[PDB]
């Protein structure tokens, strides 16, 4: 899917997690986030469209998604163990990484 769609999927499911009531909702939303983040990993954002794929900017862009995926996986673990409140708190730590990338490449 394209980057815009990946971002709407991330945004939608992050807000679901914030408001969910059960592990199943949280796990389902985190699974969708993991897939959208892993898909966006290969994207070229408009700010960097003329940069080399080997460029430091793009390496930093891809690193941001690697970080985000690792955080999503950790939240998924917490949810698979039924620590819904801990998984929801982790989702709030996700936002910082979202914002870190946006503050640079949006």
Residue 59 labeled ligand binder = no
Closer by beta carbon to ligand HEC, 1 or else 24: 1
Q: Which chain residues interact with Zn ion by CB under 5 A?
A: 1, 39, 59, 77, 81
Contacts of 25 (CB under 8 A, 6+ apart): 16, 17
Per-residue mark of binding to ligand HEC, 16-35 (x: CB under 6 A): --------------------
Interface residues with ligand HEC (CB under 6 A)? 3-4, 7-8, 10-11, 14, 45-46, 61, 64-65, 68, 94, 97-98, 101-102, 105-106
């Amino acid at each position: 899917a394209d980057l815009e769609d990946n971002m709407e999927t991330l945004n939608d499911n992050l807000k679901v997690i914030e408001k969910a009531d059960n592990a199943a909702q949280v796990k389902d939303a985190l699974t969708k986030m993991a897939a959208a983040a892993a898909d966006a990993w290969s994207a070229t954002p408009p700010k960097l469209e003329d940069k080399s794929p080997d460029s430091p900017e793009m390496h930093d862009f891809r690193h941001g998604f690697w970080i985000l995926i690792g955080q999503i996986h950790a939240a998924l673990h917490l949810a698979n163990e039924g620590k819904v409140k801990e998984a929801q708190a982790a989702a709030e730590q996700l936002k910082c990484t979202c914002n870190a990338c946006h503050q640079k490449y949006r």
